[PDB]
Ligand binder design. Structure first.
Ligand SMILES: CC(=O)N[C@@H]1[C@@H](O)[C@H](O)[C@@H](CO)O[C@H]1O
Length: 507
């Protein structure tokens, strides 16, 4: 047999350039039969759970769906608590879910008279709703009313569940600041592709972005800049709670990161007492990494960390806090081991499990409940994690979405090489680490060179679609030629959402 890899498309990107569902990520099964369902102005969404509490949760999910459908159709679809759906209805139920599909799995069966989504849990109804939106015609994704499109769904049968439990996106809001609205938008867009985790990189050398009432100068001084100089910004604790709540409506866990002991210049610029000479560091607006450190043998360091963790824990319902641990090149190995162990004890005392970048798993203070975020993806990375029974989240080069698509990309870094839409697809988590308990995947969007929402869109779309499928779709069912053609077909949907995507010439 004959095989080949993909080159660039002759005459340019199909994303330029180019009854038809566009499901991404690819579901476990999808078959189409004869006939179609028509969504009309009289349609209702019916919801029914196994008890009144569950029905109430489904009702909220139904309302979220109704809102989305209403925006593009111009209809006023309402939600009804009843297990007796009427012809032309969408029906969302957890009664009799297939347990093998797990918390996030679902069946979605469309007949001529009815759309029925059957899941084990409300979470699965939410995920299945993302597929339902992709079964309706392009135009359904519009935020304004679309005329001249019949709102049809082919008679079809879908079953689905994720391959990995953790399918995340990290946004760096330290290097450049993004508004609550901008953050909510990225969470919303990601949710449509079954991303279920959002990691906020809230602090680094160039800025500190979370209000800490016990150390107010973290904001008064530490938030006032960013890469390239200029105003910066921050989130109040109320704003952070608002982000968490918004994510929760999409069944997205928010994991906040306070990077330590490295990547700490903004803290060091805020409080002189965190420095050996007792003086504040000057703020840094460059893009160098690795140079900064907390004082690993000063008790004030651990008091500071405890105050930050106490306040963050109080406002962050996730059982996880990310404490960073990358590129502590001004911290000795001995001090790093000691420091990371001490801060893990603090986090645990406030009821939080610790996530950390490699090599944080090597800390003698880690527990089997700690999580390794494996970004290095070398043969030796996560040796400690594996021996300790720690879950691993992988973030290989293929998941570093801040990398340029190509040598000539106008934004992005390139220290992990270039990552086009194909590279973002053609990998497997088991490539990064062998013999581990792989919790899942996280796409990291560092922001050294991204200033505007358009920059975020350009780099995340279509790259994040590739990573999302790697997290959701089983390896045996992943195929670039398949995904590429599906992505071409999906393009109008990106346009309709107002995503300022890159029309990748390999698509
Ligand atoms: C864990 C990690 O990635 N650390 C740094 C991060 O601060 C930087 O923004 C990113 C840019 O790609 O490169 C990394 O080396």
């Amino acid at each position: 047999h004959h095989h080949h890899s993909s080159g660039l498309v002759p005459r340019g990107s199909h994303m330029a350039s180019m009854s038809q569902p566009s499901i991404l990520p690819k579901p476990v099964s999808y078959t189409v039969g004869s006939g179609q369902f028509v969504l009309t102005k009289n349609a209702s969404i019916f919801v029914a759970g196994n008890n009144v509490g569950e029905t109430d949760e489904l009702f909220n999910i139904g309302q979220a769906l109704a809102k989305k459908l209403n925006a593009s159709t111009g209809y006023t679809i309402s939600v009804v608590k009843s297990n007796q759906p009427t012809a032309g209805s969408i029906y969302l139920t957890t009664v009799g879910g297939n347990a093998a599909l797990g918390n996030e799995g679902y069946d979605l069966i469309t007949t001529s008279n009815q759309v029925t989504l059957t899941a084990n849990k409300p979470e699965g109804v939410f995920r299945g709703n993302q597929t339902l939106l992709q079964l309706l015609p392009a135009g359904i994704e519009k935020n304004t009313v679309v005329s001249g499109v019949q709102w049809v769904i082919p008679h079809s049968n879908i079953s689905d569940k994720p391959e990995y439990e953790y399918r995340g996106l990290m946004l760096d809001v330290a290097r450049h600041f993004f508004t609550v609205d901008e953050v909510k938008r990225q969470i919303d867009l990601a949710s449509q592709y079954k991303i279920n985790k959002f990691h906020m990189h809230l602090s680094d050398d160039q800025g500190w972005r979370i209000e800490i009432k016990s150390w107010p100068d973290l904001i008064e001084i530490g938030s006032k800049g960013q890469v390239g100089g200029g105003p910066g910004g921050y989130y109040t604790q109320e704003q952070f709670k608002d982000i968490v709540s918004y994510a929760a409506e999409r069944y997205i866990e928010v994991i906040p990161e306070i990077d330590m002991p490295g990547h700490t210049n903004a803290a060091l610029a805020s409080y002189g007492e965190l420095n050996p000479d007792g003086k504040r560091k000057a703020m840094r607006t460059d893009t160098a990494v690795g140079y900064s450190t907390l004082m690993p043998r000063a008790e004030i360091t651990y008091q500071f960390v405890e105050d930050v963790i106490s306040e963050l824990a109080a406002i962050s319902p996730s059982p996880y806090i990310h404490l960073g641990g990358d590129e502590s090149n001004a911290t000795s190995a001995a001090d790093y081991d000691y420091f990371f162990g001490r801060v893990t004890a603090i986090a645990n005392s406030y009821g939080k499990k610790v996530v950390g970048w490699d090599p944080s798993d090597t800390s003698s203070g880690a527990t089997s409940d700690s999580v390794l975020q494996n970004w290095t993806c070398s043969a030796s990375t996560g040796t400690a994690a594996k021996a300790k029974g720690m879950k691993v989240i992988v973030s290989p080069a293929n998941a570093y979405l801040d990398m340029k698509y190509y040598s000539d990309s106008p934004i992005g870094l390139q220290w992990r090489g270039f990552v086009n839409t194909n590279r973002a697809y053609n990998w497997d988590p088991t490539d990064c680490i062998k013999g581990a308990n792989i919790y899942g995947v996280e796409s990291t969007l560092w922001t050294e060179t991204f200033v505007t929402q358009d920059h975020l869109d350009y780099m995340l779309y279509p790259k994040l679609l590739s990573n999302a499928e790697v997290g959701w779709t089983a390896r045996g069912d992943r195929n670039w030629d398949d995904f590429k053609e599906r992505l071409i077909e999906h393009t109008p949907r990106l346009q309709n959402k107002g995503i300022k995507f890159f029309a990748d010439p390999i698509v």
